[PDB]
Amino acid sequence: TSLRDLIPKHKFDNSTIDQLCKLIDNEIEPIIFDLLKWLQDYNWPIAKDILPVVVLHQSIAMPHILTILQGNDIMWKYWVIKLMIPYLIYPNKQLVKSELERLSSLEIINEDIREIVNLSKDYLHFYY
Amino acid sequence: TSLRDLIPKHKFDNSTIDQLCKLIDNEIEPIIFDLLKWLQDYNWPIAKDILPVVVLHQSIAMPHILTILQGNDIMWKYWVIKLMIPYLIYPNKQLVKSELERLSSLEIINEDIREIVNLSKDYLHFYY
C-alpha cells in the first residue's frame, strides 16, 4: 500500500530496489519520473541500482526524459543522456534526436555547457 | 524460422530492428543467443542497435550470458561484461557476480586476459 513508498528517500536508500525490480512497465509508470530524479547525480550510490530499472522501463519513461532534456537541470540531462541514450531501443532513440541536436548547438558559455554540447555531438555521430 | 529470419544476416543488417523492437521476452527468447552473437565485436555497426534489445530482454538472456562468460571467446565475454552488467537490474546482476570473481582470478599471460581481469575487478568494485 503506497507506490510512492518505493521512491528512494535519499542518495543511499536502496531499501526499495528489490521491490522496484519486480514491477512491469504499467505498474511503475506513476513513479517513473520520481525514480529518474535519482539519476540527477550518478555519483550517488542509489543511482547505480536505479539506472538499470529506468532503462528497462524506458518505453513509459520517454515523455519524462524529454521534459528533463528541455529543462534547466544541466547535471541531470548530462547523466540521462550519457547513461540512457546508448541503451534505448531504436524507436526510443529516435524520439530524443531533436533534443540532442538542439543541445549540440547551444552557445558554449561555460564548462558544463561544453560538456553537454560535446557529449551531444559525440552521441549523434556514434548512435545516429 | 520466421523468428530466426529476424536475426541480422551481417554486420550492416539493420533490416529486422523494427520487428525486434516490438517483441516481448517470451517471444524473443528462442533467438536471444543468436542476437547476443552480434556483441562479439561492438565495433560492428549492427551491435549498437542489438545491445539495447538484449539488455531490454535480460531476464530471459541470463542463462545464455552465463554460457558466454563461461566459454572460450575472450572478446565476446569482454563486450558482454563491459556493456551489459552496468544495466542488469539487481537480481540479474547478482547472477553473474561469481563469474566476474572467477575471471578476475585468471593468471594474466597476455594483454587480452589483462583486459578481462582489469574489467572484472573494476566492475566488481564499482557495481557490487
CA of A123: which chain B residue's CA is closest?
A: B48
> What residues in A contact B17, CB-CB < 8 Å?
90
- Cβ count within 10 A of residue A47: 18
**Structural determination approach:** X-ray
CA of B56: which chain A residue's CA is closest?
A: A56
Closest CA to B7 of B51, B37, B42, B40: B37
> Using CB atoms, which residue from A18, A52, A90 is nearest to B88?
A52
> What residues in B contact A93, CB-CB < 8 Å?
52
Min Cα–Cα distance to chain B from A87, Å:
4
Q: Is the dihedral of CA A119, A75, B55, A98 positive or negative?
A: negative
Closest CA to A88 of A69, A112, A111: A69
> Using CB atoms, which residue from B17, B55, B90 is nearest to A90?
B17
Closest CA to B15 of B61, B46, B54: B46
Min Cα–Cα distance to chain B from A5, Å:
19
The Cα B92–Cα B54 span in angstroms is 13
3-state percent breakdown (helix, strand, coil) of chain A, nearest 5: 70, 0, 30
CA of B58: which chain A residue's CA is closest?
A: A56
The Cα B29–Cα B60 span in angstroms is 6
CB A20 within 8 A of CB A38: no
The Cα A25–Cα B85 span in angstroms is 21
Task: Give the resolution to one decimal, in Å.
Answer: 2.2
The Cα B76–Cα B6 span in angstroms is 21
The Cα A100–Cα B104 span in angstroms is 38
Cell numbers standing for residue A95: 524520439
CATH number of B1-128: 1.25.40.750
- Residue whose entry in the numeric block shows the C-alpha cell 513509459: A60
Domain ranges of chain A: 1-128
CB A92 within 8 A of CB A58: yes
Helix, strand or coil, per DSSP, at residue B20: helix
Chain B residues with CB within 8 Å of chain A CB: 17-18, 21, 48-49, 51-53, 55-56, 58, 86-93, 126-127
Closest CA to B128 of B87, B89, B82, B97: B97
> What residues in B contact A126, CB-CB < 8 Å?
48
> Using CB atoms, which residue from B21, B89, B127 is nearest to A90?
B21
- Residue whose entry in the numeric block shows the C-alpha cell 526510443: A92
CB A97 within 8 A of CB A125: no
